């Protein structure tokens, strides 16, 4: 029912200068902290009004951690470049994601922790939170080092403990933002394509959270479905379209499922 | 809140 996630991106920039490191934190689909190694402040910064009430010990601590991660990912970039025999001239990317889900009762549901190299899976914590999956043989080296250091035990304690507890804290402190459910505003548009062909577009606007499903029903897996996109004010938008065969044989309908809707909506032209 | 541990490819 709710989730907290941290996303880390590290990029080597050999032709341009020092590496770049960006960290963002989300609760559900609401970002609440950021750190950009290219920015001037060099501190973790708030991005949601409910996190601003955290005291200076919180901001100092998160800044210390994220600054260490920035340095350490520079070493990782060099290590992985060695593992894969890659030259020093190319730009490469390391990404890390971790966090926890809680159910409707706000109790621990599952934890996550994964790394990617150049946008492909590298190593991931298994669902049981006790062992690792290495995507190729190079990542087995990293697996063996993390197993010898008992990383999974400390990580499991975080994912089932601190992660869940602070997620609950954020959910209460920002309940007016995080526990809301804005229902989709739905409408349909028709536009003529040819003399004997048209297109119907099923819209959905100003909804939160981003999870939504739009399906067309003549009574169809040959349609266009754009990615859910942010409006910019904390809600989301999405549409789907059908290429109807005739100018009037258009007895299709789209169904809109979203937790802000007690029953799935039905739209017709 | 972030996990309080460093972690890398060592």
């Amino acid at each position, epitope marked *: 029912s709710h989730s907290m996630r941290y996303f880390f991106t590290s990029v080597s920039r050999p032709g341009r200068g020092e590496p770049r490191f960006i960290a963002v934190g989300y609760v559900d689909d609401t970002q609440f902290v950021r750190f950009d190694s290219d920015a001037a402040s060099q501190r973790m910064e708030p991005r949601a009004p409910w996190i601003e009430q955290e005291g200076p*010990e*919180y901001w*100092d*601590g*998160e*800044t*210390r*951690k994220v*600054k*260490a991660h920035s*340095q*350490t990912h520079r*070493v990782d970039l060099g290590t992985l470049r060695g593992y894969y025999n890659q030259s020093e001239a190319g730009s490469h990317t390391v990404q890390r994601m971790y966090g926890c889900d809680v159910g409707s009762d706000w109790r621990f549901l599952r934890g996550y922790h994964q790394y990617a190299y150049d946008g492909k899976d590298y190593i991931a914590l298994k669902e049981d939170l006790r062992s690792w999956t290495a995507a190729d043989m190079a990542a087995q080296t990293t697996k063996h080092k993390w197993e010898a*250091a008992h990383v999974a035990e*400390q990580l499991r*304690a*975080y994912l089932e*403990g*601190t992660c869940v*507890e602070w997620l609950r804290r954020y959910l209460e402190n920002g309940k007016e933002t995080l526990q809301r459910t804005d229902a989709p505003k739905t409408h349909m548009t028709h536009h003529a394509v040819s003399d004997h062909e048209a297109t119907l577009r099923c819209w959905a606007l100003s909804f939160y959270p981003a999870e939504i499903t739009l399906t067309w029903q003549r009574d169809t897996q040959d349609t266009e479905l754009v990615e859910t996109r942010p409006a910019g004010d904390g809600t989301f938008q999405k549409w789907a379209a059908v290429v109807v065969p005739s100018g009037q044989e258009q007895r299709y309908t789209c169904h809109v499922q979203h937790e802000g809707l007690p029953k799935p909506l039905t739209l017709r032209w | *809140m972030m*996990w*309080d*541990r*460093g*972690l*890398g490819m*060592m």
Partner: T-cell receptor, first 113, second 101 residues
Framework: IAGITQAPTSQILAAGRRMTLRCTQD?????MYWYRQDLGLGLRLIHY???????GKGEVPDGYSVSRANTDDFPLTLASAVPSQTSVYFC???????????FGQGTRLTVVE | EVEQNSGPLSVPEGAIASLNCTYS??????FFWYRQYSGKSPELIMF????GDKEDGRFTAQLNKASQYVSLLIRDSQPSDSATYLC???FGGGKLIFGQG
């Protein structure tokens, strides 16, 4: 016997003199720490280094500097010793920040006028 | 900070000794008990990072992050248990802070 060692074990220092306490470890620990211990105050953190190539200020950093160019060493420098820096100094390291710290032998330093 | 009673505490030889440590930072995620003999360096007794009890021979550590304390229990106190017991708490990013012992 991969461990952590400090040097020197004891030192007498005239006020105003420069002094560096050495601390090295071959455990490939990424985090290192410097503490001073005084009566009634326990251990107070002077400087820390959570990763090779960086340092940070502790509880009582004033009058002390450190550097961490390499994983192994973490030298503590007193640029101009003052009597209040008379103390026992302990270096420590952990595999990573957030994991258990292991301590060196300690350095008994006295600054005299 | 990190708060312990300075002592000195007496325990009869053979009896149970209990030590308590409180801390201020809600964000703290790892906790450590060290033993230090006079003129010597702190030696690690036990670490703990999950709520509950953790047993190691005659030693038991108890952590309650919701109540912001960590405790150490020593069973069948021996002469070699005479020492200063140091509580250490990680405040984030390498800021490892000790109580007064």
């Amino acid at each position: 016997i991969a461990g952590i060692t400090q040097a020197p074990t004891s030192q007498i220092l005239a006020a105003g003199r420069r002094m560096t306490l050495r601390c090295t470890q071959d455990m490939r620990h990424n985090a290192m720490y410097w503490y001073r211990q005084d009566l009634g105050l326990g251990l107070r953190l002077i400087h820390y280094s959570n990763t090779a190539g960086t340092t940070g200020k502790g509880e009582v950093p004033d009058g002390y500097s450190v550097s961490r160019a390499n994983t192994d060493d973490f030298p503590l420098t007193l640029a101009s010793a003052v009597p209040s820096q008379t103390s026992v100094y302990f270096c420590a390291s952990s595999l990573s920040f957030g994991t258990e710290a292991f301590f060196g032998q300690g350095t008994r330093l006295t600054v005299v006028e | 900070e990190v708060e312990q009673n300075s002592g000195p505490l007496s325990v009869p030889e053979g009896a149970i000794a209990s030590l308590n440590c409180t801390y201020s930072d809600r964000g703290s995620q790892s906790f450590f008990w060290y033993r230090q003999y006079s003129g010597k360096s702190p030696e690690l007794i036990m670490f703990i990072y999950s709520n509950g009890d953790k047993e190691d021979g005659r030693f038991t550590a108890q952590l309650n992050k919701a109540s912001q304390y960590v405790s150490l229990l020593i069973r069948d106190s021996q002469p070699s248990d005479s020492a200063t017991y140091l509580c250490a708490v990680n405040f984030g990013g390498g800021k490892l802070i000790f109580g007064q012992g």
